[PDB]
Design a protein around this ligand. Sequence first.
Ligand SMILES: Nc1ncnc2c1ncn2[C@@H]1O[C@H](COP(=O)(O)OP(=O)(O)O)[C@@H](O)[C@H]1O
Ligand SMILES: Nc1ncnc2c1ncn2[C@@H]1O[C@H](COP(=O)(O)OP(=O)(O)O)[C@@H](O)[C@H]1O
Ligand SMILES: [Mg+2]
Ligand SMILES: [Mg+2]
Lengths: 56, 56, 371, 371
Amino acid sequence: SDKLKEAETRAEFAERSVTKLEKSIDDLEDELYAQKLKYKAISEELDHALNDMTSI
Amino acid sequence: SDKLKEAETRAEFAERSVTKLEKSIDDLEDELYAQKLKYKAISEELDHALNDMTSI
Amino acid sequence: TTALVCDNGSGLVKAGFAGDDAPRAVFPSIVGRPRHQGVMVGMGQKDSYVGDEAQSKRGILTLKYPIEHGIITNWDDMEKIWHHTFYNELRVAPEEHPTLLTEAPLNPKANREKMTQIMFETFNVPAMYVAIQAVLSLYASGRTTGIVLDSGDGVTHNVPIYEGYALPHAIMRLDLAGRDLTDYLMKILTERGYSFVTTAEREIVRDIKEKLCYVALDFENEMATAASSSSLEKSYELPDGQVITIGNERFRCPETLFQPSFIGMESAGIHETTYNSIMKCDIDIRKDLYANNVLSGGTTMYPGIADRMQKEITALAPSTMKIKIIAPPERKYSVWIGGSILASLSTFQQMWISKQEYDEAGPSIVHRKCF
Amino acid sequence: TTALVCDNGSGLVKAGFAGDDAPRAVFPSIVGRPRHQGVMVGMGQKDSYVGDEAQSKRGILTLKYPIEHGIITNWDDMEKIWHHTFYNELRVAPEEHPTLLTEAPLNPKANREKMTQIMFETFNVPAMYVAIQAVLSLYASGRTTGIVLDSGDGVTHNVPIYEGYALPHAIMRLDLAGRDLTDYLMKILTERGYSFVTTAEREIVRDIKEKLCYVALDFENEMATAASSSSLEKSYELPDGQVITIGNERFRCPETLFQPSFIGMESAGIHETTYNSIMKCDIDIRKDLYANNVLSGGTTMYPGIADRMQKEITALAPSTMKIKIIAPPERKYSVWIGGSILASLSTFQQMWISKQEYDEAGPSIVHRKCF
Ligand SMILES: Nc1ncnc2c1ncn2[C@@H]1O[C@H](COP(=O)(O)OP(=O)(O)O)[C@@H](O)[C@H]1O
Ligand SMILES: Nc1ncnc2c1ncn2[C@@H]1O[C@H](COP(=O)(O)OP(=O)(O)O)[C@@H](O)[C@H]1O
Ligand SMILES: [Mg+2]
Ligand SMILES: [Mg+2]
């Protein structure tokens, strides 16, 4: 009985940890996507600048 | 005894899964660090071009 | 010879020879005189059962801890505990072994001086050294920086360290610890009908706290959930039957750590005294302390505390810094493992307070260079 | 063999072998003893971190520059800095290499004599020569005339030269430089709420000054614009988060150069001491000095200074003369590049102060023919 209780508690702890880790990794992926979006926006602005500089 | 074996197996799988998730989040955090370095460098280069052009 | 790494603590005395992985003998630090009369003759009844023997005869004893909050309030009982630890749990005479006690930060001087005087006069050790309980817990993690929150059973203290240079002006010692959580749990259990009063039943409430309580990730949501469903009610069998069912007392007992207003204490929780301890440090080592927050001590073993604390600090701290909370699985014995590592070092071998030095300067030697 | 072109400076020590384009090792000249106690044993903690190592552990050090204003105020620390420069940043023993130090104009004699005595007795170099920091900056520009304004970090001096003949009566040395601008910026940042006090946070204020401040073309118009719009407010992230926003402190910090009344100094700005230095020269070489005004030194790297200075001098000077300001992109290392060029010359190879000469006349040899 003692061993079973220990195992059950371990399982609950690990499950909660996996839930937190999944949420955190999803949030960090969202942040990376946002920063990539900003980089792409300024890169397209610079590409337009280069297109005009082709006439420069 | 049978129930203890089952619970121990599921807890061990949960531990392995959380280890895999922690490694994955480490990888993605490192990738975000690299992209943050990229944005830092590109903004620094843009500022350098700005100061060179304003200062001839 | 080998050194004895004793660690008085408050609630569990942990001892063992230097250079191992785990303490050799771990037993509660309680000394309980019998309280009833006693009619059987020749039963061999002693006058005081100490250590783990008094956790089996606790039905007819009055257990009383000799260490209240880090400080020692009853020197005779503490001497008895030390004598038991040396002679019966380790069976090594102290005349041939150096000792390395541990002491909480910001404790009264007289306590430390009396400790060294006892160790040198009564037990007559060759040399003893007193170390702060947080530096050892930092040793055990294998780090050299970081801010360690050592929430023991007597007192919770938070010592920040950088590059090996401790910051004496940033130590935040708070007297809420496991014992107050036991008393608060014993006080809120009365809301269902279970009354524990005797000093022996405090041990039963402690067992309930250890086996059932957990720290909620978000307090209000848990309070709302436990008040609607019944998926939280876990039952527990007393030492005589009559199982009890703990409802939302499960996460309300350890919540006192983050809201010390529950037991009437004014100060802020362990989630905000760490941030305050960091902010007192210099502006250039705050990132490293943020990234290397260390947990230790017994009371930090609640299931789900390493996530609640990280969430709270991330809420308080600036959004750019990375907050990481080191929670090794061997949290309970972290201080003693660090003590073993420190005693096993060659560079440390000349820092002991040798007996001839004590004979020349008296017990006040401990405050001197040999710290 | 090759010569060592060291350049003590005040704020950044720049060194490297003669004949290259850029100094091999550039690192701040600060020596910082630890100030806290230190609890980890065997961590290998040294007693003084010098150079670029103390810019990474600056959170627990007390950095102190060994050179205040050109002159050297703490000879032991300067000796330590030189020893580090020779042995760890270049890894060449000084017993087999001539050295070419640099010194500001109008400095105390004892400083120069002690410098040569150290170089000949402690490090035991074969031969060393001391050169004025402005002639080298004129070498690097490839000119042979011109008036050079070498606004370093310690002291700003303005040496006019014509056809290779220096004019000793027209050197105007002013003690406002980058360090005073750092202190003034640290003093005006307090008007928004940001308080930097520790000697470690002076480095953070220096970084703010380097990355954000710029010299305004017209001061009153900028003061009026920054007080109405908000197009100037640039933000900056401290070493721990909590971004700060610098408003009209951006162009008010380096404006002190042209109005030294801001920090209470009486003298006139760098825009008017150049004109005064020119007017002390003879009437027939003023056109050439007007046309070949040279900028050097670190502090002349502010974005937009080569236009403000030209506008000011054109306002002061007669309307017919052409005012041209030479501002090479390699301004910071201009003195060291010139030093390398001078040390690489064949005609210069017999001007070194050979050791036997020092043995015969003592340290006072430097003031003699071997200047
Ligand atoms: N597994 C656990 N879960 C929750 N609380 C625990 C656990 N183990 C110990 N504790 C609490 O920690 C206390 C022991 O702390 P400990 O680290 O031994 O204190 P000390 O610093 O005096 O050695 C006990 O009183 C108990 O209340
Ligand atoms: N890019 C920059 N923009 C503005 N100021 C700078 C810049 N680089 C350096 N400085 C200032 O110049 C100083 C360095 O001057 P430096 O030429 O190294 O002095 P020295 O003559 O002693 O070598 C620094 O203290 C800094 O305040
Ligand atoms: Mg402890
Ligand atoms: Mg210079």
